[PDB]
Design a protein around this ligand. Sequence first.
Ligand SMILES: C=C(C)[C@H]1CN[C@H](C(=O)O)[C@H]1CC(=O)O
Ligand SMILES: C=C(C)[C@H]1CN[C@H](C(=O)O)[C@H]1CC(=O)O
Lengths: 248, 248
Amino acid sequence: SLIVTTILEEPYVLFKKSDKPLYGNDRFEGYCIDLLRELSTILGFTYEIRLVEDGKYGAQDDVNGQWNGMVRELIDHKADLAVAPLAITYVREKVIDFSKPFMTLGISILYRKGTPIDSADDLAKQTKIEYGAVEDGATMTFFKKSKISTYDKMWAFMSSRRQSVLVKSNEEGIQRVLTSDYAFLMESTTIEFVTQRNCNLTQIGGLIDSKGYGVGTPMGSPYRKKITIAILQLQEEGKLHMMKEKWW
Amino acid sequence: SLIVTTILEEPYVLFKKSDKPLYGNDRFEGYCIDLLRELSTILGFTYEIRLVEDGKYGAQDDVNGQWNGMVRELIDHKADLAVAPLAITYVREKVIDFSKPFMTLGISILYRKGTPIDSADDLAKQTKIEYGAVEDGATMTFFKKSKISTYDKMWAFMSSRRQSVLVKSNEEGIQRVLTSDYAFLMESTTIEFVTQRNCNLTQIGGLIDSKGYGVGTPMGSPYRKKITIAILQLQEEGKLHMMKEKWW
Ligand SMILES: C=C(C)[C@H]1CN[C@H](C(=O)O)[C@H]1CC(=O)O
Ligand SMILES: C=C(C)[C@H]1CN[C@H](C(=O)O)[C@H]1CC(=O)O
């Protein structure tokens, strides 16, 4: 019986609503929950869902070199699978395995409508409008690791004000955008979700890069291939598209 | 020194044009050639390029269960890598390994501009306008394996006229579109390339599904992970985007 680590994130994973107390895996619904279920069927496994305890996706501390969050749990064999909006990044592929992507997205900008801002560059070359990303995120990491002119400057900007422009959750990042002169760097899929519930927000510019989400397995895990096949199957039969329709 | 199987296909791989004869790996240029080179560097390997002998990507005979083309070569350890516009399909993941995708595309329609046709459905529900795909392709296989109402219909149509509507190459498929009442089912990226060199063609409707291209390795190969890491880096540093710009 497989230990599946994950994390709360609308509409990927979230506590279901009801009137009478819920226990175990019934506590959860969401796109990733649906997906977990489909894989569960196709590959014939039983599974226990656990929320990652530190509440983080996965980042590496420069100095000591330790990993945290879901990625850490995978490394330690404390979980068998990580099923979340976990980005397939190359720093991560060096420590865990990933199924082929069940979703392709990209970094982009969340800002309110009708500003002159039209791209990442327009943000970089000024200072009035602040900007940031989820701290220890894949998105933040992209900027930290980037030797592209524009993004290096934008990183320089953020790392110098992390106290105030780097947020701890996609929610908090959206709140900043809505309550100050702030533009948020988040994933396109999540932007696409938010720009429905909030009608004064929009995606500025296009996709900055092009990552995917994948199922996290400890390195060398047999399920990496199994789950890749299952996912390829789910794409090809329209179920993944249907599932996104459903939650967006 | 790695044996790399591949296949001629504009602009992924093609004999380079000059005034003097070229030999060995100099014979070739193209997006995949550039890619091969970049991987070559990052992972430090030497390689010999061979064109797949039967001239096919990879399909499985329905009687004897045998594989052909590049996929076959990988299975037989006759080649170490397949670097081509080779689609990551689940039937294939069942016999070889694939790097994560260096390109994401989708099946779509190539037809003439200004027809009432606007989708795969509009094609299905009639017979005047014929349609087809590359025989033994990923695209053909998609329809043959599909249980979706519309596409089962379209498959029924093709398998009944397989001789006259299933073509042997992307080129021949385009030639049909341009010389008869015919709509072609090809990959979006290749459509995107063709609709520049031919100004009366266009993509009808949207992406029908959502596959990627990956580097083919024999199952259990060390390079699958290595090459996945190398590709992830190449995406993250803009090189893959630049490479597409260059060849499109
Ligand atoms: C929900 C957040 C915390 C996660 C989700 N994907 C990215 C990841 O895999 O790290 C993070 C977002 C980001 O950095 O934009
Ligand atoms: C160029 C053709 C023959 C190949 C390329 N990708 C698909 C494959 O990987 O089979 C085939 C095209 C298609 O079937 O639309």
